[PDB]
Amino acid sequence: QPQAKYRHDYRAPDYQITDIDLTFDLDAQKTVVTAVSQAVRHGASDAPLRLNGEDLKLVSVHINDEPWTAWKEEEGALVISNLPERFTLKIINEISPAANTALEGLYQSGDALCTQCEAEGFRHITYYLDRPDVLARFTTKIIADKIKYPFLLSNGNRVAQGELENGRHWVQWQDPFPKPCYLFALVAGDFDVLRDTFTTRSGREVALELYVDRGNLDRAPWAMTSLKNSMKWDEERFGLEYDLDIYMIVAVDFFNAGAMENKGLNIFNSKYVLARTDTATDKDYLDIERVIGHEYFHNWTGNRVTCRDWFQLSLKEGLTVFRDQEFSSDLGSRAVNRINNVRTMRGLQFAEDASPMAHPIRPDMVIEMNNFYTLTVYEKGAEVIRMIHTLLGEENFQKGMQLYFERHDGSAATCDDFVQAMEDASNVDLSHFRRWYSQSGTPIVTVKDDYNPETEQYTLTISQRTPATPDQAEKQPLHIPFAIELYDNEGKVIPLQKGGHPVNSVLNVTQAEQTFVFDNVYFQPVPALLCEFSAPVKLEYKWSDQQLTFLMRHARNDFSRWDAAQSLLATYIKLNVARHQQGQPLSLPVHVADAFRAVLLDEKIDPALAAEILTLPSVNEMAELFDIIDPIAIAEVREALTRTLATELADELLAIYNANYQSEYRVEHEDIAKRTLRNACLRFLAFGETHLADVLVSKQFHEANNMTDALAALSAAVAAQLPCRDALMQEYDDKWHQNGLVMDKWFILQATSPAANVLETVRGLLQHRSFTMSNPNRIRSLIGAFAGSNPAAFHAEDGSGYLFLVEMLTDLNSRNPQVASRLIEPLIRLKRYDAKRQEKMRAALEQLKGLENLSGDLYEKITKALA
Ligand code: NA
Ligand code: NA
Ligand code: NA
Ligand code: NA
Ligand code: NA
Ligand code: NA
Ligand code: NA
Ligand SMILES: [Zn+2]
User: Fold this and answer.
1) All domains of the chain in start order, with CATH
2) Active site residue: 54, 104, 209, 295, which one?
3) What are the binding positions for Zn(2+) in this chain?
């Protein structure tokens, strides 16, 4: 029942706050906050100051040290009337970190106290202008028990400290950069601290401090290393240096999201900090690197230039995601990064864009802004930034970055400001391109071709449309950069030209329908279309199998080779799902299996690329091939396809598995790539002849000298239901039960198991010694993984998965609505399923709609879903 807010309602605030002096008298049960703000009236003389506040106990209100009588509290607010044009506001209020189970505001993480203020959490700390176009200079004094909280941290530099009576002490911090309150942070606790330094290119020496729970210093150096790598890369690639003297990171165990870019004092979920080779996989290492980079990158794209309002979230997030992908891609394998980001787009983001929650990357309407930290705003947002990069090229794109910062450094900006900077600096016209900000849904691009041997011309007829979405009945054509390459019979690229002039290979597809003609095409080409996934679109082209296997062999970009393989598999995934619905077993032409045999035996192919080709689309990517999802058929077909390839390629699989053995473990990209290939081979081998598979898998688990290899073996034992499974699963538990992060991997394998009794096991794990409903990571690794990553069990025909999720959400709605709203997502996809499943999913949603004290977070999603 809160009301929707609308982007078109934006208005400049009636009051600004320029400076705020905060004091916290910290205690888990009762913290007392004193906030002295210097305010200035911009609006009308008679306009009251309206402060946001949630669950605060107001103690006093003074204006220039006069106790104020002209105020009132209303729902979510303190409204203060009859004010001068400039004045000092002082508010004292109380809060209770220990009661804060939602983990928004000031809360408790184990024995630590920490904050999360984005999007609107600072209002849970004191009454404030909790909107990101109000930027203020903060000073923060923190008073606490010295033994319990020996480290008292906030943004910026320490400027004062003292000791008090009765075992208390205090520290005061000042951050010279004006900031919106969402970037405020405070941490209090007892930590081990890893300290290091980075010297910027101009010579600024930056102290780096990573704070971790006592005992975890053995797991901190990789995050420190990645922080230095991120700082170096931002200098080399974007020309950006860190702007303060200290960079602090705190790893906390209780955190709803991944991490948070609070200026000078980032707060991280420990999953994105803590690694050592026996606890963390290669993928953990690269996610640490990604996320460390991402928060660092926000220092410019988010902090030095922030968001005018929350509808502009993608201005920081699309651009910072783009930056983290570029970082990862530059340091590591660009092809593997691009592949993975495309898998995410097509299999997860396209599903959101086809859901009741569909929105443009710059939303128009929001009820609960924490619901809009989405695949769309992030991943599609980054694809839009990448399109700009495609249209401008690197040099002009960097000119646009520089112009963006020159204009907006020190302020809150809009998506439109950013696009204008890019357009003005490059002289590329982005007026049509802007529609990508305002239109939801995934465009479908249909391509037909014609080769004319009399004129040696090749013609592409390209059409686009975006189907209506629930949020938008009106859709219009976009400016779609559509990259192509044309290949002759020997696999060489044909120069693109027309009328004697070269033609850019990025075509501008701007109309509902258009034709493009290329001259001097001396041989009928095989096209590579939408190269490097040049726009976030569904491609419709009538490929032959042979065109696709030809691209798998000859395409110049590794991405195109993988993508061609995906298009080849899509045909046969669809075929086999229809078969499955008719009771018929898997059918695959011999020449398809041969294409994958060729990948395995090709000596020149990068193993990173080979590994991706040999990784089948996930059940989520497979679901996107279909209008109506049959999750049981998809799961069974994926397995049958794995078993068919395991049998047909058994000898080649074992040979490549053995050839990529590595005795040394290194977190190095060539090594990672070999190991990904070897483990991609193991997945198939696990589905071969049982006794061979069992031996191979058990052996890898017991001989692994690193968690990447041990987990790959354990996961294969679960997936193929091998005899060794229960023993290996018990061993892992017995060894790792005290380590939450490591047990998350195990809860995911339990939740995603193909066993017939998976729900009964998942329910039993609610009582496991390593599980707790108080920890978001545990919740997501057991309950989220079941609902979101085991659609076949979640969607069991008896409706048991939906009932289970309802029960869990009934708890989480009151305990932690943000995590609840993450976990409801699979139920809101009901219209993609068959009538009988829809009926049960609607019944489940209607039960949740009637919960007493329904959170705004759930209410928004439930009302869209039931419409
Ligand atoms: Na201000
Ligand atoms: Na001040
Ligand atoms: Na309130
Ligand atoms: Na690279
Ligand atoms: Na054709
Ligand atoms: Na054709
Ligand atoms: Na437990
Ligand atoms: Zn971010």
Assistant:
1) 12-191 (2.60.40.1730), 192-276 (3.30.2010.30), 277-440 (1.10.390.10), 441-542 (2.60.40.1840), 543-867 (1.25.50.10)
2) 295
3) 294, 298, 317
